[PDB]
Each structure stands twice: as C-alpha cells, then as structure tokens.
Swiss-Prot record, chains A, B, C, D, E, F, G:
Keyword Ribonucleoprotein: yes
GO BP term, pick one: mRNA splicing, via spliceosome
Species name: Pyrococcus abyssi (strain GE5 / Orsay)
PROSITE patterns on file: SM
Protein name, entry field: Putative snRNP Sm-like protein
GO molecular function: RNA binding
Cellular component GO terms held in the UniProt record: ribonucleoprotein complex; Sm-like protein family complex
NCBIfam families: PRK00737.1
Amino acid sequence: ERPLDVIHRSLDKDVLVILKKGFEFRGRLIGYDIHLNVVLADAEMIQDGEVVKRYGKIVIRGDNVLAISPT
Amino acid sequence: ERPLDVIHRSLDKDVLVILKKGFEFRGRLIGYDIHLNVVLADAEMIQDGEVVKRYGKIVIRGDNVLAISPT
Amino acid sequence: ERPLDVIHRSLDKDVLVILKKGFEFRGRLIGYDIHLNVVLADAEMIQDGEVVKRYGKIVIRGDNVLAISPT
Amino acid sequence: ERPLDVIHRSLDKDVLVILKKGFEFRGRLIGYDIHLNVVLADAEMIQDGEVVKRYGKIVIRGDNVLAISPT
Amino acid sequence: ERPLDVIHRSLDKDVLVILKKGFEFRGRLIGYDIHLNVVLADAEMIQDGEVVKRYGKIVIRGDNVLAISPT
Amino acid sequence: ERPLDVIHRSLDKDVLVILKKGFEFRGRLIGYDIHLNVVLADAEMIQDGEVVKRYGKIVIRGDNVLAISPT
Amino acid sequence: ERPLDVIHRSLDKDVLVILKKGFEFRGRLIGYDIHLNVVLADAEMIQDGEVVKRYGKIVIRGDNVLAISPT
C-alpha cells in the first residue's frame, strides 16, 4: 500500500508521471529507485493533452515529480 | 496526535491533499511513508473548485504538499 | 526557550501558522514533530485577513512555514 | 566569531531578522537552535520600516532567513 | 533497469540532458556520479531546438536536471 | 586554494557577499562556518550600486549566497 | 572522467561557470570542494554575453551552478 509498493507493482506497466511545472511524461515503467527517480521506455512528453516529444528511453528525476499514477 | 499518527488514522478514509498552488487532490488514503509521500485511490485533481483529472490510484510526493486534511 | 520548547508549550492552545503568501492558518495545536510539521484541530485558512476555508483537523508541513505564533 | 556565537550573544537582546522578501521581524531574541530557527518575544513584522503586525512570541524558521542583525 | 544502470550503460553513448528550464544539453556521456551530475564530451546546448553553444567537455549538475535520455 | 581556505584568510578583512537576489553586502568578515554562513561587521547592503542600509554586525545565511569575493 | 576528475584536471585552467539567470562567470579555476563550490582568479561576471563585473578572486557556491566547462 506504500508509495514504493505501488511503483514496484507498476513495473512493465504504463504510467503517467506528473511534473511540478505543468506537463507530464507517459510510458512503460521499467525501473526506479528509492528517491523515486524513474526510467520509462517508449515515452511521450505530454503538454495540454498533446504529445510533444517521444523517447525510446528516459530517466526522470524524482525531485521534479509531483505524482505518479498507474494508468 | 503527531503528524504521522493523524495520517495513519486516516487509512481507508477520504482525505484532502493541498498542494503549494491552491491546487488539490481528493481521494481515499491507502498508503503513506515517513516522508509524507501518500497514495490515494479513486482520486481526482481539483483546480479552482473543479475536477480536471481522475485517477484509479495516484502516488503524490510529500515535498509538494502544503497540508493534508482527513475529510 | 528553544523553538521546539515554545511549540511544545502550545499544545491544546490556539496558534497562528504563517505561510509565505499572505496566507496563514489559525487553529488549536494538537501535535507536531521535530521537522515542525504541525497538526491543528478546528482550523481556518486565512487569505488576506479573511477566512477562506475551515477544517476539522489538518496536518501542515513545516517546510512551507515562515513562523508559528501562539495566540 | 562564528554565526552561532553571535546569535548566542544576542540572547535577551533586540535583533532584526531579515527575510528573503524585504520583510523582516524585529523583537527580543529569547531562543534558537542549530538550524537558526529563532524565537522572538514582543515581536513585530515590518515592511519598509512600518509595523504591519505584532506578536507576543513567535518562532521563525531559519530556512526563510536571509540574515540576522543584533541591534 | 534502475536509473543508474541506464546511465552507466550510456557511457561513451549520446545522451539528451533536459534541465528544468526548457533548455537541454546533448553530447557524449563520458562520466557521472551518484548525484546524477554528468560529464558530456562534444556537447551542444539546445533551446527550442536551436544549438546555441558547443563545448569540448562540460560538467552538468544533477540538481537542475529534469531528465536524461540515451538518444 | 579551497573555498574555505580563501574564506578563513579573509578574516578581519573586507569582502563582498553577492546574493542571488540582485543585491550584495559589503563589510568586514569576522566569522563563518562550514555551511558558508558568515558574519560581517560595519556592513553595507548595496543595491544597484547604492548603499541602502548599514549594519553594525550581521549574520548572513550561506544558502542565499551566490558568491563571496575578498575585496 | 567523473565530474570531480574533470574539475580537478582544470585546476589553474580557464573555465566557464554557467549560472541560472543567463549569467555566467569566466576565470581561472584555482580551488574547489566536494560540493562543487569553486574558487576563480581574475574572474569576470557575464550577463547575457556582456561583461558587467571583474574580481581578482571569488568563491562561487556550487548550489547555484548549472554547469562548468573547461575552456
């Protein structure tokens, strides 16, 4: 039920990573660490519902993260 | 009585998570950790009084939190 | 005379929690921890000298706190 | 003379606590901790040399402090 | 694949380092540390899609990094 | 010449403390600590080149400092 | 070539220190510490490509640094 528990079971699952600034990243979670830094495969940066960029793989730093939700 | 006791007593209960933006989340509290990162189930993001997003489950990082209130 | 001493003496007493914003919370202090996260019961959120919201119980994170004054 | 030495020497004396705002608190220093959180007695919040609020006692968090000057 | 595994695997490979302020750096990853500070060789600062500077080598601090993507 | 070595040697001497706020402090360095908090005597707060405030003694928190230059 | 190795090798060499507001410092690196605080000799503060100030010696706190590049 804890924050890390949820992230753990989202491995290989699609997730939404909400950033503090105002945009988001969506992709398949393939890794993470205790600081909540995360690694996404086949990711897309989203802004106002529009897919702006895509990455084969991206490591996001948890300090910028507002929230993470298994979609 | 302490911050963590209150959060612990609110498991499985509706709570309000106020962010440093007059921006908030409301949902059922299902998990948390010592950094005050929290996990809500059946959540909704509220902006200026209205629902702008919904999540089956969402992990919110405590560093962005202003306050949490059991509802 | 130390910060935590003053906070401890304020338990079950009315306090003012000033945030950086012109915003503040006023309520009965019922708990706290070493990081200055505090719990208020029968609380009010004040914006520019006016009550904009009320809460039965609220946990406020010390990281957003400018000062706390026992009333 | 170390920052901590100066603060210690200002106990029970009047001091100016400058905030990263243009705002400041002025009052009698009655306590402090290693993080530079400080407690003031018979304190006032000042803006451009004018009193905007008064406090019998107030705990100010060091994280928001720019500087402290004993007067 | 944990964050550090991906970064390690990217040594001598091309990477995109996105900073919290809209701009990015691109170059060959030649070094890094546990804080996610990174060293890029033959790097390019990019703003809105325009290369504005080139560096033989450049050390970027992880505290300002939003994300890192092995291209 | 490590950062701290340069500071220690400026004891009793005139220094310029540049803040990440657009202004600076100038005065005689009479103390400091490992966090780069510093104490200045006969200090002058300078803004846009003009002295806008003067202090007999002032403790400046290092977290708001951009740089320190021994004049 | 981790971050610190690169900085070490730049001792007594010209370096560019990029800051967060379109500001930068250029000078000869003569000292540094593990926090990436750095000391520069014969330094210039540059704003949007224009030299606005000069310092015989200056200690720059690493917390404000975005990047460092040996010239």
